[model samples]
Target: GSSGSSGQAAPSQVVVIRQERAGQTSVSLLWQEPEQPNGIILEYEIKYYEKDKEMQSYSTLKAVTTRATVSGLKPGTRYVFQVRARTSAGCGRFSQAMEVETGKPSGPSSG
Candidate 1:
């Protein structure tokens, strides 16, 4: 008699990160839940840096069904950002850091 079966399960968690309006002055951040985890995601933490100095940090404890925004930043500045997820199993691995720059301010319109 002989029987054999083997398989590896997929990753249990995932974290997606994105940025909007990245230019030279200001930018916005957007994030979403893992597609396959299905388990509860306690929160998401966002950390950013400029040139080597820490710039900002943010977090959301509530489950994000859609996306979250991070704004109010200086223009013409280069920044790096990364995210991590927390669950009952503790915090998951941090996502790879992303780079971005804020756009310069727009001029006023003339009537």
Candidate 2:
């Protein structure tokens, strides 16, 4: 009998990024799926850092079934984020960084 392997056999490719506003707060991060040899994408790793400290590193994990959202960020501040696909074997390389600014809340005009 032949043994069956149960891990991701290949790496994802052509990863893309998406940014959107969710409800009253938070920004969502969506990435395109990459081609894989085995249909076994398990999750994704999302990394983010402030614009001023872009060289440093910080990350979070999320299931493959859902998009990643960074919430309660300071309004009017710039943030940078990146994502990469993961599998039982290992995590693929990270995608290119994306930057966005959380807009300030709308208010009644004084004038």
Candidate 3:
């Protein structure tokens, strides 16, 4: 055999897209499938947490579609989000961390 492919692992990192005019309490996120999906993409996992905080208090979301909505966010708070794809092999590495704000910044100016 000339070019042989190996076993399959989790899919590549997922691309996260932002939806316009989602809301102040919720954000609609859209993602693209991994280019290097080793196996069939079973689903997607969304991990989000308040900015500057560890993943300890983060929440997870499971979605079969390319789009998902994350709710229960505190308005004017900044949050970080990441996405990963799951396949027969397992869950893949998380995508690049994306920063999102629930509402327009109205907090005390940091100077």
Number of the predicted model whose TM-score against the real structure is largest: 3
Task: Give the CA lDDT, 0 to 100, for residue 59 in model 3.
Answer: 96
Task: Report the C-alpha lDDT of model 3 over 40-63, residue by residue, as the tens digit.
Answer: 887788888989656566798888
Better of 1 and 2 by TM-score: 2
Q: Candidate 3 versus the native: TM-score?
A: 0.77
lDDT of 2: 0.65
Candidate 1 C-alpha lDDT tens digits along 23-94: 444456677666654356656656666745573544322334434444555666666766666555445665
Give candidate 2 regions above 4 Å deviation: 1-10, 22-25, 37-39, 55-57, 105-111
lDDT of 3: 0.77
The residue-level lDDT of candidate 2 at 109 comes to 21
Candidate order by lDDT, highest to lowest? 3, 2, 1
RMSD each, Å: 8.0, 6.0, 5.9
In candidate 1 the C-alpha lDDT for residue 93 amounts to 63
1 versus 3: better TM-score goes to: 3
- Highest-lDDT candidate: 3
**Least lDDT summed over 10 consecutive residues: which range in candidate 3?**
102-111
